[PDB]
Design a protein around this nucleic acid. Structure first.
Lengths: 206, 262, 143
RNA sequence: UACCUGGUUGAUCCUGCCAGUAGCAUAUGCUUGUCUCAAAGAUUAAGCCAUGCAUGUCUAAGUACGCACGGCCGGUACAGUGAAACUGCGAAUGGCUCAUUAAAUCAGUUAUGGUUCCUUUGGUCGCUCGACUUGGAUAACUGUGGUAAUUCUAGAGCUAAUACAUGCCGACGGGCGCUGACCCCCUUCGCGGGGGGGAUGCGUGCAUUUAUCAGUGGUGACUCUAGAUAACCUCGGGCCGAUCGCACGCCCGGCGGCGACGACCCAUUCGAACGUCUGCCCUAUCAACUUUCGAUGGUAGUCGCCGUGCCUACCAUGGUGACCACGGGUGACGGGGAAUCAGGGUUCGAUUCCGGAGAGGGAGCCUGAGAAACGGCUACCACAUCCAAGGAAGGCAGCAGGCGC
RNA sequence: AGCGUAUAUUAAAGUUGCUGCAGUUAAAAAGCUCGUAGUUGGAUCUUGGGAGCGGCCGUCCCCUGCUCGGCGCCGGCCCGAAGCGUUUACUUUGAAAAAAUUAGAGUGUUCAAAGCAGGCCGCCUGGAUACCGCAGCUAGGAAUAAUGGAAUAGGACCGCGG
């Protein structure tokens, strides 16, 4: 099949190697997962030593970590924006490790709001008619308010994250190989990384 | 090959088994076990060739399949089971106890012990290891794990285990002025007192050892096994006490004993 | 100045987006009595294969050569000269074996003819298996 | 034992080769009483093969309702021996040959802190807070068939499991991190300020994947081994015993040892795999070679058991050479070794031990811990067997043996 | 109870010459000079004492300086140790190096080639040792042979100013 070995190609000098043995098994090669965005699809692969290796073929959810304040939530992937390796992997919207994807902002917003007693997203003037969010932002007992006021002291999020929350899609980087483990675990882009990537996609925009 | 080998040609077999050339083609490929294949002595070789109870492979099978032999207080009915350095072979019906320890030369001694001494053994620690919930583990030379050791034992110390319970009684710490047997190299079976350890970052640390007659010899730290505090052996030693007198002296002792014998 | 390529250059060990109210550097001593140099501790480059500030561990052989070429990037060719002993004629013959070697951007100003000590580590590339640990400048070079 | 002798001239002294002289190992000639050892289809054809064998397997301990034998009182399922068959395991070792192969193989030296590991051995196996034993098929066996044909098999009726599946209870009473209703106490007249408890809800163990924080043991050196926190858990599924055998017990229906088998993870053993440094025969009538279809590096991935141009994308213009690269030849598998030898040395090493490669030539894969396996499968070239003419089965460089050479 | 022939190879072959050949005339020195790799390169830096035993003789010892307990004595001296010291080639020691083969210790296979056995009126033995170039590793030596150090002083040391 596909051989993954050194003896098929030229030496440090540029001489041709003559193959002293035919293709071995341990010099193996399987086709690329090229994992897409759809409903969950994973196929199992029996690998060397009789272990298992999961091919994510389609994947829409992943365990992402906004690790500024240590808040990680399982989130719904929507589409891919930028890819450092190749540009056609964004056209044919394939997940690979170190992609840039948009993720559902709602689990992070929910947590931030329920933790800090302030709103996030929620543009100015928009009426909060449901008023179960009212009970999450109001009605505290005596000393719990001492706890939530010494908390919300350092509740200040950065502007470039606020912008994304107001739209409703955060930028995250896939830190787990989706082809190998059958996952899409990542982390939300922040500060210097976020500025660098927003600029790279705007140069791509033109 | 395309997998693990199962045969061992009689010429390619470890030499200290002292196998002849014209008996057969193959030698007993020792079963996998606690000791290494080149540093073991298979139960078949010890039982039939040294003691000469059995005459053939069938007789060794017959002697052991009656559950008679007991290596480290546990019954073994396996002819190619690797019995190695610091083991207590306990044949129950004859009422004998043997301990495998290196003769003055590069071979195993048929060394009979007392049943009071045949209830412990002297294990060297190979690695100290932190468990899954801060549970410290020892791993000894004979592939034997003990968890919750002494918090003092470290990576080149010797421990004394009880043979039924399998737990530490005492330990000899690796430092100067401690009895050590050499268990590898050309100095295989020399008993001496540690003189100096010389650290070599990246390479193998070399340890200088002094014999009982002011004979001094070095060996890399991999091939050392401390068996005593000061000059005190913690087990019984074989006849000679790991000295290795010269071929000139060994000639003199042999023929002088022959002259006096007649 | 750094982060020229598509992907974001950073040290994977440290976290750089801690909520607050200069960047700390990951580095390590590499043993065998080698001094972790100053451009490693203080500097602001990103190198996977820098033996002081990156993911690579020195183990096995430690050799020395003399710098020949420095044309390919973050890598040098050193030239190791020895004598081979033919036994028929009780004489030697002068031989050489030039090998590809990873030079960290730590060792800023290195010229050809410098006596460069290298240490063996995991295969870094097709032909590269060694990494520069120290540099000794050629006899003089004061003026 | 560090050795010479004949032959150019009419005679001489030299250069110089031809011929003698001795061992060695293949063939061959003539000859052969005894006895102990012992090589042998390597050289040419890694050419071709008729036939027969060369790999199977049951213990007191996975499944026996074959009367195939056989105890008896059978009425309380199963005496026992045991064909077959399902299950597990082995068939990757051994054996044969030397065609490939010239920094390749291989040898000495080291590395995996860059990995995988059946088995053996020693650890782990109420650490998880939520059933006195479940499910429905199949084989053997009875029965009916098809084909010129083979270790080919379709249909019917029945019945097992450590095959294939599904799943409890227990331990189990609570801890432990958040969540926080509600409450008593004191300093200030009082706001305020200080802790104490605390209904409820969520979460939990090892393994897997990701991100963040701190600093039990070890190394020359970890982004190590442990500890904490926030989550995730692949439905083509990690673990957390619906298994078997001899013993038979311990007090008012109750009531425990000794073994076999299995199982995620860790170590150990047997290894394998990929790297480090040095080393090989002849050739210049082989002087330049490599590279956008990867040649040498850089960043990001893909694949892999892991490290890497191993393979993609975008960059950079490198890398090797008179110290013989690149190409070519080899009547070349490499080494331990063998014959010859004063001392140097020359030639040989297919050949019983270690390593490599191959099963007529190339390529692809199944199952498994381990194979790119051929006494396994799938084609395509070459060759070739049996044909009721439709189809079918092949692989001796295993042991014998036959042609050909 | 063996001997003759055919061919491959070794010594004789100092007729491949490193040890160890030749080049006026026997075969052979480029027609001549320059010249980069290659090989090879003058002399020069440590001599010298203290002390001891036999018979002026001989042979044995001593030759950079600086954090932790006991010969201990009194923060003082000694030792012990963890860290040190321009590099390499050379030589000596040590470590690690599969067996079989060769060299070789033992042993009346009836002798021998072999073999790893055996011997004593249950017991006593054996199954050694040496060599294994080159490369890597280790610790002594410092002759010989390379290489380095102050010369627009960014010299060493010594202390203050920072």
């Amino acid at each position: 099949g596909i051989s993954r070995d050194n003896w098929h190609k030229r030496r440090k000098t540029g001489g041709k190697r003559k193959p002293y043995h035919k293709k071995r098994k341990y010099e193996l090669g399987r086709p690329a997962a090229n994992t897409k965005i759809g409903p969950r699809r994973i196929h199992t692969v029996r690998v060397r030593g009789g272990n298992k290796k999961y091919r994510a073929l389609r994947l829409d959810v992943g365990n992402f970590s906004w690790g500024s304040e240590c808040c990680t939530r399982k989130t719904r992937i929507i589409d891919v924006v930028y890819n450092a390796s190749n540009n056609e992997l964004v056209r044919t919207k394939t997940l690979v490790k170190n992609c840039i994807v948009l993720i559902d902002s709602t689990p992070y917003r929910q947590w931030y709001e329920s933790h800090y007693a302030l709103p996030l997203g929620r543009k100015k003037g928009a009426k909060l008619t449901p008023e179960e969010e009212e009970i999450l932002n109001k009605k505290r007992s005596k000393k719990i308010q001492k706890k939530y006021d010494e908390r919300k002291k350092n509740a200040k999020i950065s502007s470039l994250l606020e912008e994304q929350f107001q739209q409703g899609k955060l930028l995250a980087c896939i830190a787990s190989r989706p082809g190998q483990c059958g996952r899409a675990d990542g982390y939300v882009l922040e500060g210097k990384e976020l500025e660098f990537y927003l600029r790279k996609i705007k140069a791509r925009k033109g | 090959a395309r997998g693990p080998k199962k045969h061992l040609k009689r010429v390619a077999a470890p030499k200290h088994w002292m196998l002849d050339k014209l008996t057969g083609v193959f030698a007993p490929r020792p079963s996998t076990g606690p000791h290494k294949l080149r540093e073991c002595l298979p139960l078949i070789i010890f039982l039939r060739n040294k003691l000469k109870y059995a005459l053939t492979g069938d007789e060794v099978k017959k002697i052991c399949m009656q559950r008679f032999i007991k290596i480290d207080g546990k019954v073994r009915a396996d002819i190619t089971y690797p019995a190695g350095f610091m083991d207590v072979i306990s044949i129950d019906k004859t009422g004998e106890n043997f301990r495998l320890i290196y003769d003055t030369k590069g071979r195993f001694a048929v060394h009979r012990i007392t049943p009071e001494e045949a209830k412990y053994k002297l294990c060297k620690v190979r690695k100290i290891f932190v468990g899954t919930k801060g549970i410290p583990h020892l791993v000894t030379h004979d592939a034997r794990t003990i968890r919750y050791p002494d918090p003092l034992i470290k990576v080149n110390d010797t421990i004394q285990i009880d043979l039924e319970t399998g737990k530490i009684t005492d330990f000899i710490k690796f430092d100067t002025g401690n009895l050590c047997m050499v268990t590898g190299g050309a100095n295989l079976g020399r008993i001496g007192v540690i003189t100096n350890r010389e650290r070599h970052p990246g390479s193998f640390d070399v340890v200088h050892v002094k014999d009982a007659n002011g004979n001094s010899f070095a060996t890399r730290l991999s091939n050392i096994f401390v068996i005593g505090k000061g000059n005190k052996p913690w087990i019984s030693l074989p006849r000679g006490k790991g000295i290795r007198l010269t071929i000139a002296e060994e000639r003199d002792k042999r023929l002088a004993a022959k002259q006096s014998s007649g | 100045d750094i982060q020229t390529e598509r992907a974001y250059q950073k040290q994977p060990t440290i976290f750089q987006n801690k909520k607050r109210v200069k960047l700390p550097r990951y580095y390590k001593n590499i043993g065998l009595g080698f001094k972790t140099p100053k451009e490693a501790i203080e500097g602001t480059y990103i190198d996977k294969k820098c033996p002081f500030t990156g993911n690579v561990s020195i183990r096995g052989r430690i050799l020395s050569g003399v710098v020949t070429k420095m044309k390919m990037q973050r890598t040098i060719v050193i030239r190791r000269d020895y004598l081979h002993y033919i036994r028929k004629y009780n004489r030697f013959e002068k031989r050489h074996k030039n090998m590809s070697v990873h030079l960290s951007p730590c060792f800023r100003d290195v010229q050809i003819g410098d006596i460069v000590t290298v240490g063996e580590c995991r295969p870094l590339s097709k032909t590269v298996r060694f990494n520069v640990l120290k540099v000794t400048k050629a006899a003089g070079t004061k003026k």
